[PDB]
Amino acid sequence: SFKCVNSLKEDHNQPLFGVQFNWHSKEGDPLVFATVGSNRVTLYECHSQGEIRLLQSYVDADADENFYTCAWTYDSNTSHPLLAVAGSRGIIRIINPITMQCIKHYVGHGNAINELKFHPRDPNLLLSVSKDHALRLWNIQTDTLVAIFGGVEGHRDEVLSADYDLLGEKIMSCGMDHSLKLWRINSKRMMNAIKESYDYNPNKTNRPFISQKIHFPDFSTRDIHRNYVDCVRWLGDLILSKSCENAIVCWKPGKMEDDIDKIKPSESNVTILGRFDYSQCDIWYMRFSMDFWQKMLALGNQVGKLYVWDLEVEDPHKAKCTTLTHHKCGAAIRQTSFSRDSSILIAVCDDASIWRWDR
């Protein structure tokens, strides 16, 4: 249960495509979130009585850049939080949130970057998914491209989303080819490639760092959705994914009894465990989020209504839905984010507005 305590709008009037709370903020520090839209990323700090305090932006030198996505991590040596941002230029920027300086940047993808995710156990491993049909895993400690996930048996159109499982042993990706694909990263090959990426220092050797070209997923399906698949998340060994068909589907590879780690590349079946329907979300690039504990899931629709499902129930199809509406919130909500303590939910919109809901 939540109530709307404040809203604001950013001056550019372009869509805000992304929002993320920093879940690596120190004890006793105020809750901070980043928004991305137009050619900028902006940080805000949440205070009492609904106050949303504007801090500082990073604004790209290219007026034609459009940032789509951001993801928090921290510097593994200093603990200081870092923020990665990317979008239409296909350039990943690593931003120091304190000063909003761009510390370094990576380029590879043949196009726009649609999503960034950090590995759940290793703050240096950054996944990017691209309009060029590939995913890339980067090590931002050694500045190395560890692997490219692609090929003719990889995605055949834009990759729109991906997610690591809890342990960071595998990734599920999804995109415009209507497919969801599993890529295991705990193979001997991949764990070795990771270990070598940490051993690489271009000042101490002559070799370039060789990336893995991974051209075959460990599972693939087009049997969940019938249109572009634009958001995916692991829930334990199950998958939650959505398309633009007004449903989030909960499913797993194989038959009901099949262990995720026994699934082979040729597996032809999937099992649907449930489906959460909602209304008026027919456009693509509309992302749901979960709280830190994965007890809840929030999604906005294309007319400014928020749906929140309580997943603290015995089976996925028993999820309990709550809806959150405000008479002044009428634009498409692109993404939501919960604070780490679950006390605040933020929604951002196509009209550049930001909406704060307090628990």
């Binding site: 869509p15 249109n227 572009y228 633009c244 027919d282 456009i283 693509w284 690039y285 294309q302 498409a332 196509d350």
Partner: peptide, 5 residues
Amino acid sequence: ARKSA
């Protein structure tokens, strides 16, 4: 499928 309404 359209990206915006």
